[PDB]
RNA sequence: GGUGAACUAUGCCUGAAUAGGGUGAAGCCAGAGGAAACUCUGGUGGAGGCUCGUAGCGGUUCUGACGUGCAAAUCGAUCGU
RNA sequence: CAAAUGAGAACUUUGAAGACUGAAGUGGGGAAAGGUUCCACGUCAACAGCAGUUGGACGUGGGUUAGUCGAUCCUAAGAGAUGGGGAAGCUCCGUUUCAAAGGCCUGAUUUUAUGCAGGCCACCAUCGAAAGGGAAUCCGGUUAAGAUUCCGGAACCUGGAUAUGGAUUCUUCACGGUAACGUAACUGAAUGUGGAGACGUCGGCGCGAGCCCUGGGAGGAGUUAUCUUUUCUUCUUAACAGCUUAUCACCCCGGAAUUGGUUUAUCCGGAGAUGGGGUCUUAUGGCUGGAAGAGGCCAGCACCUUUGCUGGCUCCGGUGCGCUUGUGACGGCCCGUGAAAAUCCACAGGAAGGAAUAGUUUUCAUGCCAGGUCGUACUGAUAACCGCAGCAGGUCUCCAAGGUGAACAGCCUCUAGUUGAUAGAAUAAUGUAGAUAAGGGAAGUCGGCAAAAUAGAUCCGUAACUUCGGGAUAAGGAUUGGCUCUAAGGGUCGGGUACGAUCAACUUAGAACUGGUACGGACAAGGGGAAUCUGACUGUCUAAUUAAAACAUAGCAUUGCGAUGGUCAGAAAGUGAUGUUGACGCAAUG
């Protein structure tokens, strides 16, 4: 079986340094040297993975385009749906029950 | 899968010289092809044909060019043409004999 | 190295638009997604910074301030806790029982978290092993392992 | 079903350290690797990740507590302290 | 290199006033044994990417190769 | 030549064995083939209607 | 080692320059002490510790 | 008054390395028994500063070799892990 | 052994043999170190402890080609200026401190570029990784020696000015999908926020890649007194681009006890299961482009311009507790929970700007230019390093074929590499290393030192004692080969409301037969038991005479200290360690 050599002068396996066997268009076996695997992107609010965002190196989000970093709502490329749907439900009911705080207080000024 | 093939040997080199005759090497081809590993079974199923200058063999079943070199080798080994004759091939099931 | 979970807080800065993050030390019982109020009207609620002198009697606090402002000094390590004697109104001033059992006294504006340390019964378990004693002073400091003078 | 007489969860320490420190340390390995309620949403959820860290893994929800235990007895106690304290101020 | 399976993105590919290398590649290619047909490909070459159209028409290709405008490197072999 | 001969049973007998028969073949191994074998015939049985749902469940607990 | 300074690969190059044997021509001059290169190194014998 | 932690000792920071077996902990499944409490049996599972044993790391015995040596500490077998 | 080269050949080359490393190599690369040992040509005085025509020697030359491989950039433990404070002083502390420590848009925009009201701050040096984090490259060819750098094709990234292709002057800053979200684009300042970078270890399971095995076919080589359609070998496809392709996750829709689904591992479901429908991350695979024109395998012509030309083939598969690596979804562990920063993007927001051929889109596509500097040969070790040396020592790491077998054990073999080590003569005593031995069996000896002795696997059987976990492979016994058979154990479908051919792999168990009773036949491979002293155990040390009963250890106990503190450091200091600490702690002891 053929046996194959690190590419780069590093001699070690770290990291920065994994190797994978491929063979050649010249029929011979060589080592290929892959990088690492990209980590999805999570959401702000409860850590889960994006979806609908491409995985990358954080510098290759440089040169794509914005559909791919991002997804068509609001908060979109940040925070998933339910998150954001979560945020939603939340900031409208509360400002409602601020409105009946709001006039709870308000019948001390008609009663002086 | 099952379509006959036609290989093909062209004798013409060892038979200009009268060294080699394809009378005895086509009776020796028949008798010693086997299918299915046994006696009794050249049934129409492979056949020899013999011009006198050039032999060829069809198969319906089980047949190859690396069968008809392994026999070929042995009746060339066994009357003592090696090392003057090779079983070349020209194209895809094309064999000849050469002397060089 | 620590014993005692810590509590990552996020306050809102009263004088900027920014989120100021802040590190407590863990109460047990508070968990993420909780409220704690902090200042003089808080409310006695475990989590939250109450001045000592703005609690009852009997309270059990931690991470006290020895010092209005030194931002906690007492009762931080996992289980342990302050309680709150009583009160010197005049010259204001509360006296605290510590952890070691000694009694201190100092002014009533010092704050701490309402509330017992998390990670309590830590030292009620065998370490069992010399290399579990290994593990725990790898992370602290190279106090281990003893060789005696003799 | 039943492997080990006595020993149960310290059975890997087979042979070492006395019966009296390996049944010590059995009752609180058996609290620490327990599987917990979780008040905040009703399902038996709550792990330990480390020493006074523990996660409920529906909700997502990380409570602050014991080192071996979600809730050490201390801490229910000083849970009505504080609890008995504030009502004075109700009535 | 880039893939075309549409023609006239091929034509606006040989007007772009960028492209003006072509290749023509004929290959014995075998999709079934009683049709062997023989398989032509347009490797047009522009800047940033290297363009081929495959065509598995015999009979289409000398229709295509007749539209091509006389000024571009041709290169058959 | 050799490969067929123990292909047709010769030279496994207990003369010839040197590792354990765990260490042949791990009984794990050979208890995650009988369950899987099980399974798959269970889910067979209830996507194709011989058994229902509540027979498959209890002859699932019992596999 | 290949992964060398740019000073490092100048050192080597002096010393590379300077392990040559006498020229044959200052030989002849007059008045000439000089037989051969007192200052010769092999790499075996003796390292130049840089 | 200076110079050394390129050996070595210890902390820290950042990396890398460690066949194949034996044993068979918790958790889990199914049966059996029982009024209950719970007990039993067969599996599953894969724990341990466990164990046999390579690489590795050490260095027990022969008080073996050598002992103007291959060597200012090595060599071989036997060994610990 | 022979030849050739040379006065000169045991040692140099070539061929023929015989052997060995036997893929944790005597193979193929690197790190540190060396520094030219690389390579070529001449050449043998000295060196290579014999030899020498040979050489890591001698003399003369040639050789290391980068936007993409590294450094550089970033921060890590930590070093260290300034402010300031000590110090007679060389200097010491200190690293954000008691310091007056800050850019980019049409501001202005004609003595003007700061002559002069245009904001946000709350940044505090810098050095420290050629194995950490990082922008981007592959294949084929090429040399006496360089190559992921040269050449030929084919890409990518960063920086840099306008410009064309699709959209505003009748809604100014896109549409679609109930939704997860999609697409070629589809303004967005200050300020704020989030993500990636960015992480331990072990175990089983799944899925890939490569390797291993194997059927057909198309070639070449081997064997052919006799004999499997036989033995060996070639049959390959990079980066990148497009399409497609997933466990997990999520959305819509009947709303579930006869609880169901479901993993090897038992988790999940009214907080919405099962079921039916539904997106994306070249995870990974497939197809196409790259790309057959390359490369590889055959056949044929060239016949002394240091050079090619021609014809083909390069195709189909199958298999698995296989090996290794990667990935995934999981599960175990911790009083241990397993860096940082640079950098990049996203989001929130709503400052500013937009109507007669215009305004913006340069996060869509296409187009243009540049990418400096330093390193790049070779060895990496029984001769290129260090040990005074060409020293049996020491010195970090990647790849890893077949058979036997549990096995990167031992043994044998393939690819690759070596065949080196002063030699020649019958080999006395004594040795060193390896062995055998009648009868006895430790009588030897300080002492069973040394050696020997059933050692693998399967079945059986297993005592005292015990902290109930062990002891335990206790002890002890039987079997094992070859052959010819038998039995059991699996995977893949068309449903008028129990059915079969296909196909497939090694684990068990049994029987008969057979032989100079042999059979884990080489290799490999526990002696065991009854007790005492001692240390609980695992672990550690006197490198180079002591490995232990010594030291550690968990456990136990005692001591000091609530910070203007305990313990400790410093010549001092506006100085330090514990301390990113706070009695469930730190420190000091037994």
């Known amino acids: 079986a053929q046996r194959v050599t690190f590419r780069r002068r590093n001699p070690y396996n770290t990291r920065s340094n994994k190797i994978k066997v491929v063979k050649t268009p010249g029929g011979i076996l060589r080592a290929q040297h892959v990088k690492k695997l990209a980590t999805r992107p999570k959401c702000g609010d409860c850590g889960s993975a994006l979806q609908g965002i491409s995985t990358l190196r954080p510098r290759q989000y440089a040169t794509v385009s914005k559909t791919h970093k991002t997804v068509s709502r609001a908060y979109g490329g940040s925070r998933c749906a339910n998150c954001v749907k979560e945020r939603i439900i939340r900031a409208f009911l509360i400002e409602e029950q601020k409105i009946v705080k709001k006039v709870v207080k308000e019948q001390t000024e008609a009663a002086k | 899968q099952k379509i006959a093939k036609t290989f093909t040997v062209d004798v013409s080199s060892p038979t200009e010289n009268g060294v080699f005759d394809p009378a005895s090497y086509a ?57 003057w004759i090779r079983f070349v091939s020209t194209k895809t099931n094309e064999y000849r004999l050469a002397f060089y | 190295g620590r014993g005692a979970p810590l509590a990552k807080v996020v306050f809102r800065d009263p004088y900027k638009y920014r989120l100021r993050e802040e590190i407590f030390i863990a109460n047990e019982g508070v968990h993420t997604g909780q409220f704690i109020y902090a200042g003089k009207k808080a409310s006695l609620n475990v989590g939250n910074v109450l001045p000592l002198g703005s609690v009852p009697e009997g309270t059990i606090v931690s991470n006290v301030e020895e010092k209005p402002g030194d931002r906690g000094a007492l009762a931080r390590a996992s289980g342990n806790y302050v309680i709150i004697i009583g009160h010197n109104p005049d010259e204001n001033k509360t006296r605290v029982r510590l952890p070691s059992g000694a009694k201190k006294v100092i002014s009533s504006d010092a704050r701490g978290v309402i509330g017992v340390i998390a990670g309590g019964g830590r030292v009620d378990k065998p370490l069992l092993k010399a290399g579990r004693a290994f593990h725990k002073y790898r992370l602290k400091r190279n106090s281990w392992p003893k060789t005696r003078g003799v | 079903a039943k492997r080990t007489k006595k020993v149960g969860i310290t059975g890997k320490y087979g042979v070492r350290y006395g019966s009296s420190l390996r049944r010590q340390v059995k009752k609180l390995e058996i609290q620490q690797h327990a599987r917990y309620d979780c008040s905040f949403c009703g399902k038996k959820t709550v792990k330990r990740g480390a020493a006074g860290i523990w996660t409920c893994s529906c909700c997502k929800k990380t409570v602050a507590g014991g080192a071996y ?12 302290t504080i609890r008995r304290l504030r009502e004075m101020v109700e009535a | 290199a880039r893939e075309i399976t549409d023609i006239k993105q091929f034509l606006e590919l040989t007007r772009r006033a960028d492209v003006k290398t072509a290749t023509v590649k004929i290959n014995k290619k075998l999709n079934k044994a009683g049709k062997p047909f023989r398989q032509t ?37 | 030549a050799h490969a067929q001969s123990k292909r047709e049973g010769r030279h496994s007998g207990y003369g010839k064995r040197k590792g354990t028969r765990e260490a042949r073949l791990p009984s794990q191994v050979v208890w995650i083939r009988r369950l899987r074998v099980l399974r798959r015939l269970l889910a067979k049985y209830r996507d194709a209607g011989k058994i229902d749902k509540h027979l498959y469940h209890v002859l699932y607990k019992e596999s | 080692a290949a992964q060398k300074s740019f000073r490092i690969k100048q050192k080597m190059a002096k010393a590379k320059k300077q392990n040559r044997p006498l020229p044959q021509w200052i030989r002849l001059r007059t008045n000439n002490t000089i037989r051969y290169n007192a200052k010769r190194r092999n790499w075996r014998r003796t390292k130049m510790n840089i």
Request: hydrophobic share 40%; no cysteine; charged share 25%.
């Open chain 4, 69 to 80: 235990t979600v809730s050490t007895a201390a801490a229910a106690t000083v849970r009505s």
């Open chain 2, 27 to 83: 009776k020796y081809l028949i008798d010693h092809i086997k299918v299915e590993g046994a006696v009794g079974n050249l049934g129409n199923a492979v056949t020899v044909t013999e011009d006198g200058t050039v032999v060829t063999v069809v198969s319906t079943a089980k047949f190859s060019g690396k069968y008809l070199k392994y026999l070929t080798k042995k009746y060339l080994k066994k009357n003592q043409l090696r090392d």
């Open chain 5, 41 to 77: 490909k347009f490797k047009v070459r522009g800047s940033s990417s290297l363009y081929t159209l495959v065509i598995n028409d015999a009979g289409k290709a000398k229709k295509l190769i007749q539209s091509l405008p006389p000024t571009l490197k041709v290169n058959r072999l």
